Amino acid sequence: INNRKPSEIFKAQALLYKNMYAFVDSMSLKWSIEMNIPNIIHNHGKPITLSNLVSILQIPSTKVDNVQRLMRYLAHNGFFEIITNQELENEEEAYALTVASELLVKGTELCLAPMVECVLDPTLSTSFHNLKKWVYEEDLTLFAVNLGCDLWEFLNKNPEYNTLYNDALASDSKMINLAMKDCNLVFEGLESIVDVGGGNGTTGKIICETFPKLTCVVFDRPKVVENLCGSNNLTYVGGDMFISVPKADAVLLKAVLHDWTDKDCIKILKKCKEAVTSDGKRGKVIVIDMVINEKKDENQLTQIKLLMNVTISCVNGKERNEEEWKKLFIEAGFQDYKISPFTGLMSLIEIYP
Amino acid sequence: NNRKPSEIFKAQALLYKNMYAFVDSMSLKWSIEMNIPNIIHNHGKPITLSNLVSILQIPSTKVDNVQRLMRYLAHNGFFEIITNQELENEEEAYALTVASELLVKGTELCLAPMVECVLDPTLSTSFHNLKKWVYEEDLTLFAVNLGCDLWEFLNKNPEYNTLYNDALASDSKMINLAMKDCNLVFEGLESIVDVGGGNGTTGKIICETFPKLTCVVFDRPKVVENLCGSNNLTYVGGDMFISVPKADAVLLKAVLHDWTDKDCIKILKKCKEAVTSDGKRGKVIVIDMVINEKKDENQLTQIKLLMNVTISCVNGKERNEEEWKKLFIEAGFQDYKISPFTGLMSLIEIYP
Ligand SMILES: Nc1ncnc2c1ncn2[C@@H]1O[C@H](CSCC[C@H](N)C(=O)O)[C@@H](O)[C@H]1O
Ligand SMILES: Nc1ncnc2c1ncn2[C@@H]1O[C@H](CSCC[C@H](N)C(=O)O)[C@@H](O)[C@H]1O
Ligand SMILES: COc1ccc(-c2coc3cc(O)cc(O)c3c2=O)cc1
Ligand SMILES: COc1ccc(-c2coc3cc(O)cc(O)c3c2=O)cc1
Ligand SMILES: [K+]
Ligand SMILES: [K+]
């Protein structure tokens, strides 16, 4: 402002407006999903013209241009590819899917539409209007502050959401499976592994099916693995990771450490190190979680990771940058580490004792 | 749908960015409600996190949450993070940027009121029901989700008056700034007619910036029915489709975007004769958005395409340069020139 060139001031105004109206990026995405446009295009078997698209959707004539404008914006953001014969005015444009919208085709193994609808649930998403009240409350999560209940209770009293939540879990399961396929260099030489905080063993199964020779122990709290049956190379063990971790060539901590403070992670890591360095053996600890690094990642990637650190903080979680991870490893008594890609948001970290 | 893993993961990252985009908006709203811009401004220099949370009186268990929000806002351009004096010893400090200087309440160009209004819970959540809206003939987004158009809503809920008025007040300041950067446009003009001039706010800004100019605020009879103007400002009621008062120049600010091409042609023709009578040859001035993916910066096109959607929710129709050009041609004009106005609007000079 101060004695700046109007152009500079107006450029800032535009930036302000982009962030102010950023929620429309979300709502437009949600709209495309609720309208089932990605599936309609998929069913069409080729790029679909605007006229055929609104005809199938049965869009009122006074709203056809609104649909076009929405499609244009979504296309700009990478969700559709506008196919049009330049230099042929009378001819309309067509909409083709992009990798991003193919991931929105309901019924497919990797479909992220469910995750999107869960995130954009009116009740949950609107809670972010009260970030101020939330930062002034000790310990409470954003939802505890805004809804008076935790996501678990919300899930229990919202069947629609619960249905989406479960679809989202299935899809994410397929994403991890896809991710695991390129990790042969990490797992292929192991004879045994323990998935610490493994839950219902979904991850352990993926690991076992991917690496048939590897034996896996799904380790979690007793009540979590309570009446689960292990089969061929996959077994369940109940316990407390802070007290003791089952011995193995490697330990896996997937989406576990981001739920704990630095002090607790160090303790967890120490127990895991213990688990892979007994009987005169020297294995390794594998951590699958987000690694923030503004120096190594592309600016657009750092942006979503930073965004995610904010969102998870709302549920008292924490994403860490590489230096922070390094600190933890050193404090836990490890000698070195290596980071590799896992998914577009999570990385795989190998920690050596 | 056989894609490479890397393609799939990049697409997932893209999806997460868009589904969580509303947080960009909410974190911005948060910084304003926390008066962070003002706190940094008053400090007179970059503020350390410790000093910031101290002034804010943030509970110890949420200090890192505030840190993550500031880090994200900084990345998006609202703050500059300054590193510590010692190595190994983290304390960053936060400095304002041009974007956040616009969020410092009390300053002349503050846009915080605009943000607070747009991001009002009741108003902003209407966007959750875009589907219902596109299946309704003619209704605006607000009419469909609030039950009535925004004007009626404000009448029924007076509390939103100070919010809306203040937002409009911040926008006029942007207009005033823009107007003072348009000397070359109003140079040589003795008279101007603001067609669809509304209450005269724009005309007042024009006359004040150019005491040399005389302006006629032209609008529907009932719009200027009981309005009084200054010595260089007067009001005239009528219908632009029927007849537009003569003058050296005609101004159409945020008018053409709410009419179909056919009606714009009608208006533009009436404006043409308005500045080409009595053997004189003036020009028509249009202030509205001009979309151009070929000449605009990527980020500018981004917001214009977004605003293209938001404006349509109120039945507005923004146009790209090619479309504007075609309307000017069919209207009988010979040439045009587009100049910078504000961040999202341009100023087009049309020559008959
Ligand atoms: N002391 C403890 N010992 C073992 N598991 C624990 C634990 N405290 C919490 N957990 C487990 O932490 C897990 C966090 S969810 C972890 C995610 C999971 N590995 C995945 O791939 O989705 C839960 O399954 C929870 O029961
Ligand atoms: N036939 C007509 N003649 C003159 N003004 C008209 C009109 N039909 C609609 N309008 C006017 O169109 C205007 C659109 S909004 C005007 C905004 C104004 N130029 C600004 O810069 O803020 C309204 O003031 C409305 O009264
Ligand atoms: C620690 O793992 C987690 C736990 C919770 C989230 C999470 C964060 O923000 C949200 C916002 C919404 O509007 C709706 C949601 O449904 C969520 C989540 O589920 C993200 C990662
Ligand atoms: C060009 O004129 C216009 C017409 C409409 C708008 C506009 C667009 O989206 C909004 C969204 C909200 O949540 C609240 C609002 O209050 C608005 C507006 O006022 C902005 C400028
Ligand atoms: K400057
Ligand atoms: K296609």
Ligand SMILES: [K+]
């Ligand atoms: K699905």
Ligand SMILES: [K+]
């Ligand atoms: K408060």
Ligand SMILES: [K+]
């Ligand atoms: K919660």
Ligand SMILES: [K+]
């Ligand atoms: K125990």
Ligand SMILES: [K+]
């Ligand atoms: K994580």
Ligand SMILES: [K+]
């Ligand atoms: K780092």
Ligand SMILES: [K+]
């Ligand atoms: K919202």
Ligand SMILES: [K+]
């Ligand atoms: K309206």
Ligand SMILES: [K+]
């Ligand atoms: K009402």
Ligand SMILES: [K+]
């Ligand atoms: K416009």
Ligand SMILES: [K+]
């Ligand atoms: K264009």
